[PDB]
């Protein structure tokens, strides 16, 4: 057991840890950040994303 107490100094106090693993993979992606899409155009020179 850790036995955590209010009187403990920093380093003996409890910390909550969350680890987010990411996969930047060649596979189809499902979790995208909050961006909006634009119309698709063809046969033009564009900056695409």
């Amino acid at each position, epitope marked *: 057991s850790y036995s955590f*107490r*209010p*009187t*403990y*100094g*920093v380093g003996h106090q409890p910390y909550r840890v969350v680890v987010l693993s990411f996969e930047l993979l060649h596979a189809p992606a499902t979790v995208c950040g909050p961006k909006k899409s634009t119309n698709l155009v063809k046969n033009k020179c564009v900056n695409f994303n």
Partner: antibody
Amino acid sequence: ITLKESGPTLVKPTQTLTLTCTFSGFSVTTSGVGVGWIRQPPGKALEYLALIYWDDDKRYSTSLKSRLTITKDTSKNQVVLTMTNMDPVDTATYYCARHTIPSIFDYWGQGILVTVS
Amino acid sequence: PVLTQPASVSGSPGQSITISCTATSSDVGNYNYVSWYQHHPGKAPKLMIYEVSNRPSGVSNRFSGSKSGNTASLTISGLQAEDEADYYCSSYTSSSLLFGGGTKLTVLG
């Protein structure tokens, strides 16, 4: 966020004192929140008695550990503290208060005066 | 393992009053969770300061505090005639929590 107290005000020597605290406006089943008891005998400072946490963890003052028992019923928002072998010297006002870490006790009730005789 | 306080403090309204509370043990550890209460006779104790220097809601900005070493201080600025109460300090120790002896404030006039 209120806490009310009820129970005996007069107890005979060597008998057992039972006090019930009923609270409303909050739950005691949430993390970081518990309910504890404090007493104040005349002319003296506040004395810690007992504390029960949301997970039914029960802690007591080291000098009264053998005399106090604290239990709770989360369906009625009630906490009950029993103190055995009441001494004639155990005359004090008892208080029910909400327990948290960053602030030890708050939302103190008005308290109940108990005299042993 | 006892919190030590002065028996009483006093001064005129409008003046600054300091109420001290000092630990007498190392059991307090970080001593970073000091609470102060204002107790009026016939009424439930009210929390004025917590975590050394923070205020609860419903508390006048005249009340503030700080720590130095293992000693905490409660400062009452702009002293009012309504501030006559028994002030208590509280903190954690290794197996329990403690309350201070209590300091009686008197307002002069």
